[PDB]
RNA sequence: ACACCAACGGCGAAAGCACUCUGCUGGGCCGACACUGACACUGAGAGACGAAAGCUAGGGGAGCGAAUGGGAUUAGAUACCCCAGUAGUCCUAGCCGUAAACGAUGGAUACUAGGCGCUGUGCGUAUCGACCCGUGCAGUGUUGUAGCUAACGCGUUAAGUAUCCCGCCUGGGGAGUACGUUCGCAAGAAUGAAACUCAAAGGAAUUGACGGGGGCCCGCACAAGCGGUGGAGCAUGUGGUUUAAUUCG
């Protein structure tokens, strides 16, 4: 072992940010366009 | 503002030491530099009378036991006040060391400032008195909150 | 005692405000658990990476009656308690085979509750 | 400020002050900052009057209220109205918003 | 209830519609002349559908969660926070017919630069087979000429140029209220005034100020020190009180 962290590095493949997303309420296209517009532009 | 121009620090008047000159500037109260000079060298001539080592050795060995490595800086994030500890530098620990040493040396009564600074100085040299206890109570508070960062 | 086999799973319930470091065998009988509320301090302090480090250390320091070589860790959930816990287990340095995540990834099951507005 | 409150200090310029004036001051100011729980240090209420039949200019009654509070700064409000009573009620309203600005800004 | 797929994507007249599969069935688009020969457009009144919440009847009820109840913050908290939590949420059969039901843009036809796209099909190139290039159309998007516009902007999907058809508007309150009538199990929906009163009510843009909106940078501004005031005594100044005056500023 060495102090390298590939679980965090691999973790951003399918981020735990789908769990900070799912704590608060099911809300419609205003905040899904805010979160998924900022997310469709974060990957481009 | 950016920074302070680097530093100029001279050594001791009669021993050529940059620490003891720092201590004679810290015992100075309003310009009476010959009197603070007198108090420090009567404390050294007192420390030759108590034990029989170098006063640099008992002084530096004393202030090693006063200097902390970490202290509490009550910082803020988002309006929330964490008591997070941040590792203090070296010469900062010198200034704090002779700070607590000197102010605590201005409490132990009975006799003139040579005996007062001598007594709290050897109490720093033996882990007793009040300056090293002040090191502990400022040291066991930053130890108590390591759950911040 | 226990079955006395030095391989066994470790689960880390890293909550949003807590951590739980439990350790159990292959069948699932727990041999020890120790959380941030277990190791002393409690309140807003628990659930920080120092609580993950101390809770993991006081969790797996008591398996020295076993002395488990082949470790494998199965963490769960979001929070600030993951990376300090893995640095704690790698600090104990026992034969960590693979860490893994077993977090519940729902497929739009239940409605999560109201947004906070604070 | 009858009891327990901030220390009241009046100023009367061009104005002979009466019972109803400073009574209306401590009751309107003091009893509208009576639901406070504030240890404000000092209230300076400076209550001057001017003009109309007194001198040149329209009839004016002008009050300034200043609070030297511990709680995030000092505040002052000057209003100028047709009567003393409308002045002091109006400054009473302004200082209600300024103190709710202070208390409400202490949050989290 | 249906993660990734999910796309500034496809379909529907709108509302809406996404786990997959099957069945019945609507609608769109494209080609050949294969047929009829103006059968077209709009639409008063009318009829249908019509998110969510609501109501009748019966199921069902995990999560979430009005009301409610407790805890907290708070001067106070019927609120934001937290813990329980009922109607409701889902389904069957209905009623209700309103939404920022928004593209804040009724529908239809004809005509008027381009660039960059996407979706569906069609032709030719290229290979002979997936590509790939141009294109013929239809639809969807983004910058944009002309022109229009008070401006912002819109711009072949016009807010352009014209033609047709229907609706609605004529200052702001009063007021989507009053009264009447129809509909509705009720909740209410629709139709819809006036008395009186005001000289404004509004739109777009600009300049400032302000923000418990950002970004950047100084200042003994905070932080780090050092020394004080506030405690005591006195000197002095002011306010108040008193006095014939305690001059006035």
Curated annotation (Swiss-Prot), chain A:
Q: What part of the entire protein does this chain span?
A: 95 to 138 of 180
Recorded family membership: Belongs to the bacterial ribosomal protein bS21 family.
Q: What does this protein do?
A: Component of the chloroplast ribosome (chloro-ribosome), a dedicated translation machinery responsible for the synthesis of chloroplast genome-encoded proteins, including proteins of the transcription and translation machinery and components of the photosynthetic apparatus.
Q: Which gene encodes it?
A: rps21
Compartments (UniProt record): Plastid, Chloroplast
Q: What is this protein called?
A: Small ribosomal subunit protein bS21c
Subunit (UniProt):
Component of the chloroplast small ribosomal subunit (SSU). Mature 70S chloroplast ribosomes of higher plants consist of a small (30S) and a large (50S) subunit. The 30S small subunit contains 1 molecule of ribosomal RNA (16S rRNA) and 24 different proteins. The 50S large subunit contains 3 rRNA molecules (23S, 5S and 4.5S rRNA) and 33 different proteins. bS21c binds directly to 16S ribosomal RNA.
| Top-level lineage group | Eukaryota
UniProtKB/Swiss-Prot annotation, chain B:
Q: Where in the cell is it found?
A: Plastid, Chloroplast
One function term, GO molecular function aspect: mRNA binding
CC annotations in GO: chloroplast; ribosome; small ribosomal subunit
Q: Which Pfam families match?
A: Ribosomal_S7
**Some GO term, biological process aspect, for this entry: which one?**
translation
Chief location: plastid
- HAMAP family the UniProt entry points to: Ribosomal_uS7_B (MF_00480_B)
Q: How does it assemble?
A: Component of the chloroplast small ribosomal subunit (SSU). Mature 70S chloroplast ribosomes of higher plants consist of a small (30S) and a large (50S) subunit. The 30S small subunit contains 1 molecule of ribosomal RNA (16S rRNA) and 24 different proteins. The 50S large subunit contains 3 rRNA molecules (23S, 5S and 4.5S rRNA) and 33 different proteins.
Q: What is the protein's name according to its record?
A: Small ribosomal subunit protein uS7cz/uS7cy
Q: Which organism is it from?
A: Spinacia oleracea
Q: Which gene encodes it?
A: rps7-A
UniProtKB/Swiss-Prot annotation, chain C:
Instruction: Assign the protein's first listed, main location to one coarse class.
Output: plastid
Give a GO biological-process term: translation
Q: Which GO terms describe its molecular function?
A: rRNA binding; structural constituent of ribosome
Q: Name one Pfam family in it.
A: Ribosomal_S11
Which GO cellular component does the record give, naming just one? Answer: ribonucleoprotein complex
Keyword field: Chloroplast, Plastid, Ribonucleoprotein, Ribosomal protein, RNA-binding, rRNA-binding
State the SUPFAM superfamilies in the record: Translational machinery components
UniProt-annotated location(s): Plastid, Chloroplast
InterPro entries linked to this entry: Ribosomal_uS11 (IPR001971), Ribosomal_uS11_bac-type (IPR019981), Ribosomal_uS11_CS (IPR018102), Ribosomal_uS11_sf (IPR036967)
Q: Which domain of life is it from?
A: Eukaryota
> What is the protein's quaternary organization?
Component of the chloroplast small ribosomal subunit (SSU). Mature 70S chloroplast ribosomes of higher plants consist of a small (30S) and a large (50S) subunit. The 30S small subunit contains 1 molecule of ribosomal RNA (16S rRNA) and 24 different proteins. The 50S large subunit contains 3 rRNA molecules (23S, 5S and 4.5S rRNA) and 33 different proteins. uS11c interacts with bS21c.
Q: What does this protein do?
A: Component of the chloroplast ribosome (chloro-ribosome), a dedicated translation machinery responsible for the synthesis of chloroplast genome-encoded proteins, including proteins of the transcription and translation machinery and components of the photosynthetic apparatus.
What the record says about family reads: Belongs to the universal ribosomal protein uS11 family.
Protein name, UniProt field? Small ribosomal subunit protein uS11c
* Species in which this protein is naturally found: Spinacia oleracea (Spinach)
Curated annotation (Swiss-Prot), chain D:
- Main localization (coarse): plastid
- GO-annotated molecular function: ribosomal small subunit binding; rRNA binding
Keywords attached to this Swiss-Prot or TrEMBL record, sorted alphabetically, are: Chloroplast, Plastid, RNA-binding, rRNA-binding, Transit peptide, Translation regulation
GO terms classed as biological process: negative regulation of translational elongation
The disulfide bridges present are none
The protein's superkingdom reads Eukaryota
* Compartments where located: Plastid, Chloroplast stroma
GO cellular component: a single term = cytosolic small ribosomal subunit
Role played: Ribosome-binding factor involved in light- and temperature-dependent control of protein synthesis. Interacts with 16S sRNA nucleotides at the A-site and P-site, where it protects the decoding center and inhibits translation by preventing tRNA binding. Stabilizes 70S ribosomes against dissociation. May be recycled by the combined action of ribosome-recycling factor (RRF) and EF-G.
Q: Which family does it belong to?
A: Belongs to the HPF/YfiA ribosome-associated protein family. Long plastid HPF subfamily.
Q: How does it assemble?
A: Binds to the mRNA channel of the chloroplast small ribosomal subunit and interacts with 16S sRNA nucleotides at the A-site and P-site.
Return the protein name. Ribosome-binding factor PSRP1, chloroplastic
This protein's species is Spinacia oleracea (Spinach)
- What taxonomic ancestry is recorded? Eukaryota, Viridiplantae, Streptophyta, Embryophyta, Tracheophyta
